[PDB]
Amino acid sequence: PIYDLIIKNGIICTASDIYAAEIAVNNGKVQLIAASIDPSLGSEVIDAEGAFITPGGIDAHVHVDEPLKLLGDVVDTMEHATRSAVAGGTTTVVAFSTQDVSKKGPSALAESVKLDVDEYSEQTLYCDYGLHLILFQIEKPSVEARELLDVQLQAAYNDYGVSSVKMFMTYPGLQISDYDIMSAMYATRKNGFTTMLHAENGDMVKWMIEALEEQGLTDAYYHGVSRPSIVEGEATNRAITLATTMDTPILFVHVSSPQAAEVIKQAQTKGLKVYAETCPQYALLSDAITRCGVGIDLSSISESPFTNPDDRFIGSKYICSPPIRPEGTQKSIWKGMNNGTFTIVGSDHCSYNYYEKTSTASKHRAFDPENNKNGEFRYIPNGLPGVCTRMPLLYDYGYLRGNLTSMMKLVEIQCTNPAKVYGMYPQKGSILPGVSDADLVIWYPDDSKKEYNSKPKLITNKLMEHNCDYTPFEGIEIKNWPRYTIVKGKIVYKEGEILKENADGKYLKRGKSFMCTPKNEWVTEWRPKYE
Amino acid sequence: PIYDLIIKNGIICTASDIYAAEIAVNNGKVQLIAASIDPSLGSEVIDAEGAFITPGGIDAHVHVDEPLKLLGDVVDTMEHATRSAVAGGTTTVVAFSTQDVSKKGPSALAESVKLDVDEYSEQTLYCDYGLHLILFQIEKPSVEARELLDVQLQAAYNDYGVSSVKMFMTYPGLQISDYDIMSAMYATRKNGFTTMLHAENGDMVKWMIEALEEQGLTDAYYHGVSRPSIVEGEATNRAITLATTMDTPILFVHVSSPQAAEVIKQAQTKGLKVYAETCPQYALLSDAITRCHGVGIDLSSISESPFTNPDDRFIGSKYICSPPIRPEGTQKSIWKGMNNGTFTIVGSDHCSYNYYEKTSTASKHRAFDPENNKNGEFRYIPNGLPGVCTRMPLLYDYGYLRGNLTSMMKLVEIQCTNPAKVYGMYPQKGSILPGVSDADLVIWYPDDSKKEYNSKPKLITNKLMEHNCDYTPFEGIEIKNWPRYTIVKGKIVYKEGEILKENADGKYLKRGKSFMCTPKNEWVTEWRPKYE
Numbered sequence A: 001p002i003y004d005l006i007i008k009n010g011i012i013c014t015a016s017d018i019y020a021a022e023i024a025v026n027n028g029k030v031q032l033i034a035a036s037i038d039p040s041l042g043s044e045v046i047d048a049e050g051a052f053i054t055p056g057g058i059d060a061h062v063h064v065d066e067p068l069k070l071l072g073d074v075v076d077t078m079e080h081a082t083r084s085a086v087a088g089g090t091t092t093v094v095a096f097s098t099q100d101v102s103k104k105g106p107s108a109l110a111e112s113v114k115l116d117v118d119e120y121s122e123q124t125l126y127c128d129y130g131l132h133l134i135l136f137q138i139e140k141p142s143v144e145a146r147e148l149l150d151v152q153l154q155a156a157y158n159d160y161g162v163s164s165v166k167m168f169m170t171y172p173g174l175q176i177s178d179y180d181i182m183s184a185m186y187a188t189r190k191n192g193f194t195t196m197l198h199a200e201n202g203d204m205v206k207w208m209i210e211a212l213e214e215q216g217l218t219d220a221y222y223h224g225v226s227r228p229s230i231v232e233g234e235a236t237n238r239a240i241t242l243a244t245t246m247d248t249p250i251l252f253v254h255v256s257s258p259q260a261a262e263v264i265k266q267a268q269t270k271g272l273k274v275y276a277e278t279c280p281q282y283a284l285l286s287d288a289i290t291r292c293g294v295g296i297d298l299s300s301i302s303e304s305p306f307t308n309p310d311d312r313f314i315g316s317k318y319i320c321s322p323p324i325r326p327e328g329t330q331k332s333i334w335k336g337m338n339n340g341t342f343t344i345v346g347s348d349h350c351s352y353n354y355y356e357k358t359s360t361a362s363k364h365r366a367f368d369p370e371n372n373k374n375g376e377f378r379y380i381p382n383g384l385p386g387v388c389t390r391m392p393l394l395y396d397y398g399y400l401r402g403n404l405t406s407m408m409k410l411v412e413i414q415c416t417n418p419a420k421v422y423g424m425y426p427q428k429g430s431i432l433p434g435v436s437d438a439d440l441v442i443w444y445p446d447d448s449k450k451e452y453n454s455k456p457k458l459i460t461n462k463l464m465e466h467n468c469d470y471t472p473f474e475g476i477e478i479k480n481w482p483r484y485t486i487v488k489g490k491i492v493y494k495e496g497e498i499l500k501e502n503a504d505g506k507y508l509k510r511g512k513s514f515m516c517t518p519k520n521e522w523v524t525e526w527r528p529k530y531e
Numbered sequence B: 001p002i003y004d005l006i007i008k009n010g011i012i013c014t015a016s017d018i019y020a021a022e023i024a025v026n027n028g029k030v031q032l033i034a035a036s037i038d039p040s041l042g043s044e045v046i047d048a049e050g051a052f053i054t055p056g057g058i059d060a061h062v063h064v065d066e067p068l069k070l071l072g073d074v075v076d077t078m079e080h081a082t083r084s085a086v087a088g089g090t091t092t093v094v095a096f097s098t099q100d101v102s103k104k105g106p107s108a109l110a111e112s113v114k115l116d117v118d119e120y121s122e123q124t125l126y127c128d129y130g131l132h133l134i135l136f137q138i139e140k141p142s143v144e145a146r147e148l149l150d151v152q153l154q155a156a157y158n159d160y161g162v163s164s165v166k167m168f169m170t171y172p173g174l175q176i177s178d179y180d181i182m183s184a185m186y187a188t189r190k191n192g193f194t195t196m197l198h199a200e201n202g203d204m205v206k207w208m209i210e211a212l213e214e215q216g217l218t219d220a221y222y223h224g225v226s227r228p229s230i231v232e233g234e235a236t237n238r239a240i241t242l243a244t245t246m247d248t249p250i251l252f253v254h255v256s257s258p259q260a261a262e263v264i265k266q267a268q269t270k271g272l273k274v275y276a277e278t279c280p281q282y283a284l285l286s287d288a289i290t291r292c293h294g295v296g297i298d299l300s301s302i303s304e305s306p307f308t309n310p311d312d313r314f315i316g317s318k319y320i321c322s323p324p325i326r327p328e329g330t331q332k333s334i335w336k337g338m339n340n341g342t343f344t345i346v347g348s349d350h351c352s353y354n355y356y357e358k359t360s361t362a363s364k365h366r367a368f369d370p371e372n373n374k375n376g377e378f379r380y381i382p383n384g385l386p387g388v389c390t391r392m393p394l395l396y397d398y399g400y401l402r403g404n405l406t407s408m409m410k411l412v413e414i415q416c417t418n419p420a421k422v423y424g425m426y427p428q429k430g431s432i433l434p435g436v437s438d439a440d441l442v443i444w445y446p447d448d449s450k451k452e453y454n455s456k457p458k459l460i461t462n463k464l465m466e467h468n469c470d471y472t473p474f475e476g477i478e479i480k481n482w483p484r485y486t487i488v489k490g491k492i493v494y495k496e497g498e499i500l501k502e503n504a505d506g507k508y509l510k511r512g513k514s515f516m517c518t519p520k521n522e523w524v525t526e527w528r529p530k531y532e
């Protein structure tokens, strides 16, 4: 026959279309869309039985264990994360390269990427992955700082196809000044990079943590109290101001604050190139879960402060940054996904064990009496596992339960926009004959009376296919799940089973994003020298 | 051969993708998309030479001559309008059926549509067309009326596939009170119709026109002065408030006011189902063009205007429409609205009256009728511009090529796909879907070519419009691309400047319920409609 694979009787969903058609796949790529394709032309035929077919999900906010250990030891390798991703319908992930301050000169940032690529080249990869670069040390003063930095960004792009840079406005060791952000923006704009910011006011966070500890208020729940949404709002406002002065396109990661969403919306209405990301957890969970409706029935989650009130430390399962917000906030995150505030949705996947206490990758790492650590929220490793649950959670709580407008909005923010904003388009993100990698998800049919033994009813840890010992969504009902995950024209997940023999993932060299060319709009008569 | 038509070497543009691929067409529909299709498989092969291929344009705001003469006599029939559409890359138009106050009972609104369908069934149609229903007489009081109106909308949908209703907040004879709008919203929400509003405060317009005439300020330019942007803003705010109270999806037609755009955006941010339309003229023209004397058209390059003919005091009427073309500095707002999601769709508000003949009932000079106490005052000027032909090329050029729109995808979204979705013609129309889409396609000229194309026009002229009007307001301006092929239901109807009449086979279109116009189910108080 002439094609490797034909998908029949399915409904194709893209960022802008929903329709019944059939797909042929060959040599790792989408080859054809047509009404009906002769089954004898394919080596393998999949009957979708009326189910939706979506592009594979693209999660551009994933944390994996890396050699510099910026977030300490993390339980998931690239092997584990990509396995988990695929079991949950995600077929591309983008992780983070930590700037290595021991490397100097023109190649310093390319050498930072090399550490990661070399490490992951020996692991079994279930899908493709890319890398963002994290920057936390910027040279001073600016006029030099901006010029050698320029050469370094070119080298990172030319050698490894990295075109995105991530910076922090909070966290000791990561927080950089406004002045240094401007220096970076100068370089990124010039090179057409995608500039990413974690926008919380680090000074306010630090002061409030100290004030809480002084009163002995150190339980997990006070992580939220130390940094209310007005702190994320202020910083996001300040960061927009910087981007405006510098005419530099900007993406805010994991937005959770209504105040932040407000200033982001206002900038987008003005036509400034301000992009935003949010995460399932900010729409589905509230901070009531950290101690003892448009989201998850919180009492249905198992192994939480509600079910285990004797365990005072169990709130740590849900500690992340920015914090899961108070009741009443979650609805404005859904509205943000529908109204255009959020360009993409990522997971902020970051995994630390709860049911083992001794390892360096345990949440209980917060207990270290010999290093003046006694379980205070300050010392809790921040993050939740989420790479597997991202796609099904939006399918269910978003599309089926009506919190997202349609399947097309789902695809737009989960698949196509991530590819576009991070320079993986059109190789990834869509279903384009002759062009797209054959990265596809076939779901189960929604309106069927037929029983599918392989379709899960609840989220469990075993279902995650990851290396962590818990998921925060443990025990909750889930109303659909990937029935097939196809990665580069091969079936890698089938009806609850991973097919390791079809794992052929590779590092992905990315291009410059067409969304991140500058507006050419300025506040004053000043222009950068190179203009 | 197995297929009627193959398009090779082109670049496919949809509402969310841009990519090089080839298309096969048979029996009026898109059959196949693939990297490369064997040319021996097609009866006809078109080499696109690297140019973009878009879906055909869908203009859901077109006015044609109709038997009840709501807008007086209009120069274009459905024959003329669809010919003009096709010459400009538009492959579906939606015009308007005037409520016939002489028909009574359950079938009264279906009977209104029948008048139009019957009349156009004898004309040569170059592409498909649908109809919106215009409502200006609502029965009172609301409760007792509910059954009849509800039953009437059902009959209009069941018999003629009409699923949209249009109402006016201005114009004597058309303006309806807030009370009556709520009665209509009650019925339309219940039937999943698309509710359309022209939102200008009619009372403010009426008062200010009388104030201006009292001072003798009657020239065409004072049309704009009689109804500044704050008037469109107020009424748009009022209409949103009504739609909110009634949990009814709403579309605002030809939005031109920054204040209107602002309250529209705020509602969209809240998640209310508020949609909006704008038109090329609100982004490209300013009111300076209505009397003698960088993001729009260079106004001095327009031929046959108050700039070139300052002797002709009435020539400003060529550019009189409602809402008015706005003062300098407003036009940029409209582009931003197209980019940031404020505007769901772009239509033309195509409405044609002759300028170079003065005697007929379809002339602009209709405003001169000494016996009916009419002496050229702006009040008597028939409102409207021809635009159905120029809509797609104007956005291609001044939008995509000149960088006022963000991408070709955004162009397709607002010009083709969203119009189909919001008015229940999707997926039959609006996209390029194998086995599903009517083969309605445009092949442009290649942008980056050094090759000469004798058939590619450099300027907009009246002759190029292929319409029945004797002017276009964009006469004389540079245009940097144009449809090279317009394919309608798998047949070539426009090729390189020539209309192919023998391939004209357009039909009336029965439309469905729009998936965008199901209600949000969100209310201001504990009250719910009886049927829920």
Ligand SMILES: NC(=O)NCCC(=O)O
Binding pocket: B063, B071, B320, B321, B322, B323, B349, B351, B383, B384, B385
């Ligand atoms: N307003 C205008 O330009 N023409 C009359 C058509 C209409 O808007 O109903």
Ligand SMILES: [Zn+2]
Binding pocket: A198, A253, A254, A321, A322
């Ligand atoms: Zn972060």
Ligand SMILES: [Zn+2]
Binding pocket: A061, A063, A348
């Ligand atoms: Zn993170």
Ligand SMILES: [Zn+2]
Binding pocket: B198, B253, B254, B322, B323
């Ligand atoms: Zn109107």
Ligand SMILES: [Zn+2]
Binding pocket: B061, B063, B349
């Ligand atoms: Zn109109």
